[PDB]
């Protein structure tokens, strides 16, 4: 007596898809047909931050829009001053295979993790005057792919363990675990209020989670292949996702379905990172093409290209004031554009 | 403002201290050769690591042959889905692929061949050479001599395979054992050659998982890999 559950799941899926189809009275492209195009957007490389020895895997901006941490797989976690290009810190990591970065909103801590399955948290504002490991969060059974601070004492991490987790940094314990994904969770994005977050996994699906209740609220299944990047729309009511499809898509939490798709015929490479601009009209996405493409989030027209990297673009981040875009790459340089 | 000048000066001193440390780190990062040890659970890769050393997500082994430093990384508590965390190793000098010449229990050799195919033809691993350790050769020999082996009815093309002229059997090597092991080697070499556009090469070896020569094998293959990379870089 097991086939009955399969039949019920199929019926529930049919019900959900029918409800979504009913709700899709109109498309976003139709309603946005009448707004003025953004026009070609050109950005010059204002800064080029160099000093990492190997491919950069992650970067994160500080809340002040001036300091940014980057992780490279040479085993270093460098904190930069983007205005002056001066290095503020250079933290050597125990495991060289870091693949994620985080900057505490307060600026007091940074985090990182990777193939060691551990999220290490570093105290920057030490009384000793030197950076030291504040805490090592252990408990994931697969590589750490993303992490984001909620406060100085809470952090949400995703893993190839196929699960996401919330931690109490003081106690070092896993407050809650978010399960339901089928493949490796690759990216992660906190809402502006940090009450919800969204994750994309290697199962072509994205899920919306409740940080405190600890369950999946909605699941979005537009993509065809592994999701590599996910970002929240500044409003918090939508989020964009990128995948090996060579496509980015926009989902709305309230409509519970895809809104718009960002693809081109000559783009046949996966998307490694996505980000929005301050207003949310520009969607910036990094590609395996070594290029980053700017998309009009409402028209789906490619409004520009951030060419200039000579290898895979792995990370991409817009400052909290929207003043600049940082782009890391496998060529081991970070570039800042305006 | 004097305070602004003082802060700028302090930032510059901190930056130059950081870069003075980074240069010292770079000098050692460029002198080390990173290796990815890959294989299966039933393959004797763990025994090979044990020899080289005389909840963790990744294990690191440090060894040096002559004065060259080698940093070999073994994958620990990682799920069996490798398509994402294997992109991290696109800049190692070589991948050491350990295979057991087999003879639950299934045909492990075909899945080893498929894994080698995926590694060889992956987009990010098209520049990485593979040092192929055809391991557990004594077991293969003893099982082939007993007349109960995997090859005959799992690889029907074996029934019409003849040992190459380039084969170099050991003095006490039974002809059938050498035929079987060279067939297994050619199975991997077909995949290696079908897409070897000159950016990477495969180095097959017959190993027994307890050998003092495995270190030398890796050393010589890495020397060959980097020599060919340099020859290509300079148009020969």
């Amino acid at each position, epitope marked *: 007596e097991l086939d009955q559950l399969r039949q019920e799941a199929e019926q529930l899926k049919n019900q959900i898809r029918d409800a979504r189809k009913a709700c899709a009275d109109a498309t976003l492209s139709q309603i946005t047909n009448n707004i003025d195009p953004v026009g070609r957007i050109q950005m010059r490389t204002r800064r080029t931050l160099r000093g990492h020895l190997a491919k950069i895997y992650a970067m994160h901006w500080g809340t002040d829009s001036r300091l940014l941490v980057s992780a490279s797989q040479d085993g270093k976690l460098i904190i930069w001053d983007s205005y002056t290009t001066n290095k503020v810190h250079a933290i050597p990591l125990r495991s060289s295979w870091v693949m994620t970065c985080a900057y505490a909103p307060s600026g007091n801590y940074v985090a990182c993790g990777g193939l060691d399955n551990i999220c290490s948290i570093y105290n920057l504002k030490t009384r000793e005057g030197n950076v030291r490991v504040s805490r090592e969060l252990a408990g994931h059974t697969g590589y750490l792919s993303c992490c984001r601070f909620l406060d100085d004492n809470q952090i949400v991490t995703s893993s190839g363990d196929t699960t996401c987790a919330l931690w109490d940094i003081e106690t070092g314990q896993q407050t809650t675990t978010f399960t339901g994904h089928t*493949g490796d969770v690759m990216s992660l994005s906190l809402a502006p209020d940090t009450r919800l977050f969204v994750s994309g996994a290697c199962d072509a699906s994205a899920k919306l989670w409740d940080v405190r209740e600890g369950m999946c609220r909605q699941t979005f299944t537009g993509h*065809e292949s592994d999701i590599n990047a996910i970002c929240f729309f500044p409003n918090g009511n939508a989020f964009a996702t990128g995948s090996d499809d060579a496509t980015c898509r926009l989902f709305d939490l309230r409509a519970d379905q895809e809104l718009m798709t960002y693809s081109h015929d000559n783009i*046949i490479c996966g998307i490694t990172s996505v980000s929005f601009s301050k207003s949310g009209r520009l969607l910036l996405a990094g590609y395996d093409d070594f290029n980053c493409n700017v998309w009009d989030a409402l028209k789906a027209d490619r409004a520009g290209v951030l060419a200039g990297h000579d290898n895979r673009v792995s990370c991409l981040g817009v400052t909290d004031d929207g003043m600049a875009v940082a782009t890391g790459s496998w060529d081991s340089f970070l570039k800042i554009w305006n | 403002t004097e305070d602004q000048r003082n802060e700028e000066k302090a930032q510059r001193e901190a930056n130059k201290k950081i870069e003075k440390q980074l240069q010292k780190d770079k000098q050692v990062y460029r002198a080390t050769h990173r290796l990815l040890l890959l294989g299966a659970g039933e393959s004797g890769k763990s025994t090979i690591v044990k020899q080289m050393r005389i909840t963790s997500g990744i294990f690191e082994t440090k060894f040096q042959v002559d004065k060259v430093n080698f940093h070999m990384f073994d994958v620990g508590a990682q799920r*069996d889905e*490798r398509r994402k965390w294997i992109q991290c190793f696109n800049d190692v000098t070589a991948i050491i692929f350990v295979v057991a010449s087999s003879s639950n229990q299934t045909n492990r050799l075909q899945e080893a061949l498929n894994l080698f*195919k995926s590694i060889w*033809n992956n*987009r990010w691993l098209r520049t990485i050479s593979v040092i192929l350790f055809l391991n557990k050769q004594d077991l293969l020999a003893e099982k082939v001599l007993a007349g109960k082996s995997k090859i005959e009815d*799992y690889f029907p093309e074996f029934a019409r395979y003849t040992t190459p002229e380039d084969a170099t059997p050991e003095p006490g090597e039974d002809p059938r054992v050498t035929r079987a092991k060279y067939f297994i080697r050619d199975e991997f070499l077909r995949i290696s050659t079908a897409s070897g556009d000159g950016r990477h090469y495969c180095y097959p070896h017959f190993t027994c998982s307890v050998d003092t020569e495995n270190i030398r094998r890796v050393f010589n293959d890495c020397r060959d890999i980097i020599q060919r990379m340099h020859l290509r870089q300079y148009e020969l």
Partner: nanobody
Amino acid sequence: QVQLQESGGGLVQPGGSLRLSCAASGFTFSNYKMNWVRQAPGKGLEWVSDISQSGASISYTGSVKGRFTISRDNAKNTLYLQMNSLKPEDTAVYYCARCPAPFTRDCFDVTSTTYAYRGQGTQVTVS
């Protein structure tokens, strides 16, 4: 949503014939390499055969070549596996596995214990 459902199976006498079919949906079928994998009772997932995007390249596991024939027809987004001269040892659940990514020549995790882009599976039994 990426979805695959296999068809065909049931009881077959030894030396008999059977044609398995898979109905693919949720992705551009023509852009992906496809595989056939099977999990016999008490054993792990095995790879049987694969067919490239256009059908130009085909390979089989050595134990079924000469018996099984893999074919894809991109127009109807269906993958077939003609399998005749079945032997008792061919008893297993057969799943259809998709390539992880399009435009790609490697297939990494099709035989893994849990794979997102795999079908539910159809039982094939030989008396």
